[PDB]
């Protein structure tokens, strides 16, 4: 409740963004979701088809809001966030599998399905969508149109498709064509029938494996792009690259396929506007520490504020929560930042409260806080001559005190007690 004379560091100040900016490529055609989802027939798990999606706007909200899907799981993104996210390319893969195999579809799994026909990567980023299609693609006699690969010489790599019907031979004895000893047809048909119990029923699965934030985005959300404003601290969003800073035209040279230019700390410090092919400079808005200069509280409650590192023109143009000193009339721009609430004077005195760069603050008489350039000492010209000497005719015995720390408190800490109190 009482603070001694000095200068104290207080919560940093920062220029908040004035407004948001959204910049997406302008496209209106919806993606062919109806083609992949409502296709007449789906391919087999081993013959899983991969349909490319590009140059379109995808409204993922409609897909997620449909209750017909028994499973809608996203592994690198949230389904809600998809609507606001701009992607490079999307691979929509469709196949029909047994219900029990839905778990194996998830990344990092294993099994005959996961090791012979369809394998996801460990770092998969995307959404998997499935829904029972027993009534759609099942028959009482057994809709054997859907097969899977049970025999394979070696495990397939992730996102690998095998169509060859070569007869595998686990127990050596390589045959071909007709089956026989140790050699069987690799593909086996499912018994997809309506009478089959849950899990054995066929399931239609569509999985999206889009890549994220690594290249000029092509497909992205049904959110209208806003106008472009520069030279202002604003929030920008270039194809899902959200951030905060002050835009500015740049003399940059991006190669035709370049969109983002990153910083040493892996931060984008220059962007290319998707709508107009121009390069903009990116710079997080101005910031700095806030130091309060005060004499003793019991000496006075008047204070001065230093916005260190930012020149004063910005401050009239935030975080500190008290924009009442902005009235000014005594704002002084020092090399250490803007100083508010202190009267600048040309008289130089001994430093009292250090501010930096040779500037010090003092509380003197009517009373006010002043800022000045510190004085190093009294000027003195020694009366040197080549035949003149000064000799002391008298003396003073001086006794001066010197204080030196010698020891500090001996402290012991019981590790277990501090971390695990009698537990």
């Amino acid at each position: 409740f009482t603070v001694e004379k000095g200068i104290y560091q207080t919560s940093n100040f920062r220029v908040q963004p004035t407004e948001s900016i959204v910049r997406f490529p302008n496209i209106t055609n919806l993606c062919p979701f109806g083609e992949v989802f409502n296709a007449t027939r789906f391919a087999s798990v081993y013959a899983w088809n991969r349909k490319r999606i590009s140059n379109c706007v995808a409204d993922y909200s409609v897909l997620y809001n449909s209750a017909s899907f028994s499973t809608f799981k996203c592994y690198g993104v949230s389904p809600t966030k998809l609507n606001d996210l701009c992607f490079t390319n999307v691979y929509a893969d469709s196949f029909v599998i047994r219900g029990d195999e839905v778990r194996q579809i998830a990344p990092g799994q294993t099994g005959k399905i996961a090791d012979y026909n369809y394998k996801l990567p460990d770092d998969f980023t995307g959404c998997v969508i499935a829904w029972n299609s027993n009534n759609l693609d099942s028959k009482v006699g057994g809709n054997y149109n859907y097969l899977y690969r049970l025999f394979r010489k070696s495990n397939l790599k992730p996102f690998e498709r095998d169509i060859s019907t070569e007869i595998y031979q686990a127990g050596s004895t390589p045959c071909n064509g007709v089956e026989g000893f140790n050699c069987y047809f690799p593909l086996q048909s499912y018994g997809f029938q309506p009478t089959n119990g849950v899990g054995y029923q066929p399931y239609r699965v569509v999985v999206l494996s889009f890549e994220l934030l690594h290249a000029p985005a092509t497909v992205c959300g049904p959110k209208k792009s806003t106008n472009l404003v520069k030279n202002k601290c604003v929030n920008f969003n270039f194809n899902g690259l959200t951030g905060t800073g002050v835009l500015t035209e740049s003399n940059k040279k991006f190669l035709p396929f370049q969109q983002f230019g990153r910083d040493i700390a892996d931060t984008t410090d220059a962007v290319r506007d998707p709508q107009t092919l121009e390069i903009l400079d990116i710079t997080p808005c101005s910031f700095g520490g806030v130091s309060v200069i005060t004499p003793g509280t019991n000496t006075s409650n008047q204070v001065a504020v230093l916005y260190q590192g930012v020149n004063c023109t910005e401050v009239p143009v935030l975080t500190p929560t008290w924009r009442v000193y902005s009235t000014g009339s005594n704002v002084f721009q020092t090399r250490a930042g803007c100083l508010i609430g202190a009267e600048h004077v040309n008289n130089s005195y001994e430093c009292d409260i250090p501010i930096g760069a040779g500037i010090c603050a003092s509380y003197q008489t009517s009373q006010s806080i002043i800022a000045y350039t510190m004085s190093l000492g009294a000027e003195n010209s020694v009366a040197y001559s080549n035949n003149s000497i000064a000799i002391p005719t008298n003396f003073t015995i001086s006794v001066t005190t010197e204080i030196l720390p010698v020891s500090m408190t001996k402290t012991s800490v019981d590790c277990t007690m501090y971390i695990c109190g009698d537990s």
């Binding site: 560091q9 940093n12 690198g76 993104v77 949230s78 809600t80 966030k81 606001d84 996210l85 980023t125 994220l212 934030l213 899902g240 690259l241 959200t242 951030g243 910083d263 040493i264 700390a265 892996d266 931060t267 410090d269 997080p284 101005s286 910031f287 700095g288 520490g289 260190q308 590192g309 930012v310 020149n311 090399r335 250490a336 430093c351 250090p354 930096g356 760069a357 040779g358 510190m374 190093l376 000492g377 009294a378 000027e379 003195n380 010209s381 020694v382 009366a383 040197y384 001559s385 080549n386 035949n387 003149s388 000497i389 000064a390 000799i391 002391p392």
Partner: protein, 285 residues
């Protein structure tokens, strides 16, 4: 804000880190004050440079320059070159790569001009007053007579200086000239000062480069994690970055504390040299 609220669960780690760095920054101003502010009067050499034949022009201030630095002092300030960017001659924002991520450089309390004035006052006091200004009021004495006292201090009778005053002055003037030539030609003379600049710049760059690490998260970009994941699963990714970045900052601060201790020991030695070698004649070998 999402990351900031999570960071509150770690207590006062951030307050300790800021407090530790503030202690270092304040100590740097103390180090300079101890070494250079050893004289409470700003002595100035007389206009007539009759010092018994001794040339001090290359170490006395040059009024022509905007900064009253001696010829040799100018050479020293040119040999040492910054590494990242202006710390300085900055007329605007710091303009550094570190600035982007909450890292700022504070100007020293004493400007280079002020430190040069202190050096000038110490130098003017020595050549016009010998060692007296360090023990009390500056008592003028002819420089040749002062050198006679110095010779007595090393066991050589003062008649040796007077009978060889012209020779001794020439040797001193020649010796000073060689210092000027050495600094103008060689580059690694100020390796000690350059090492300090390089070490601090290198550590600061490592701290900034550490923001590009995933630390096991899906991405090293905080905004990307927030834009792609919902709060529940975003926190798991955010927490991985907090742990790594918090560990990175602690590593930086601990190294700075250890480096600051080394610099403080060096500054204490420089302050002792200023008192015992400049303000007096030392018999320590």
């Amino acid at each position: 804000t999402e990351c900031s609220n999570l960071l509150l669960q770690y207590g006062s780690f951030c307050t300790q880190l800021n407090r530790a760095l503030t202690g270092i920054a304040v100590e740097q101003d103390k180090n300079t004050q101890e070494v250079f502010a050893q004289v409470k009067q700003i002595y100035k050499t007389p206009p007539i440079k009759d010092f018994g034949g001794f040339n001090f022009s290359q170490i006395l201030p040059d009024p022509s320059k905007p900064s009253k630095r001696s010829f040799i002092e100018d050479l020293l300030f040119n040999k040492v070159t910054l590494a990242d960017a202006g710390f300085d001659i900055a007329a605007r924002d710091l303009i550094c790569a570190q600035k982007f991520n909450g890292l700022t450089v504070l100007p020293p309390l004493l400007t280079d001009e002020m430190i040069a004035q202190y050096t000038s006052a110490l130098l003017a006091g020595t050549i016009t007053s010998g060692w007296t200004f360090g023990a009390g009021a500056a008592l003028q004495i002819p420089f040749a007579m002062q050198m006679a006292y110095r010779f007595n201090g090393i066991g050589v009778t003062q008649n040796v200086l007077y009978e060889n005053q012209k020779l001794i002055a020439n040797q001193f003037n020649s010796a000073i000239g060689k210092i000027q030539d050495s600094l103008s030609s060689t580059a690694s003379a100020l390796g000690k000062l350059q090492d300090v600049v390089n070490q601090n710049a290198q550590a600061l760059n490592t701290l900034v480069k550490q923001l590009s690490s995933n630390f096991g998260a899906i991405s090293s970009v905080l905004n990307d994690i927030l834009s792609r994941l919902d709060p529940p699963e975003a926190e798991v990714q955010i927490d991985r970055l907090i742990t790594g970045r918090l560990q990175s900052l602690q590593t930086y601060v601990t190294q700075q504390l250890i480096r600051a201790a080394e610099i403080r020991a060096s500054a204490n030695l420089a302050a002792t040299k200023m008192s015992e070698c400049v303000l007096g004649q030392s018999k320590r070998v």
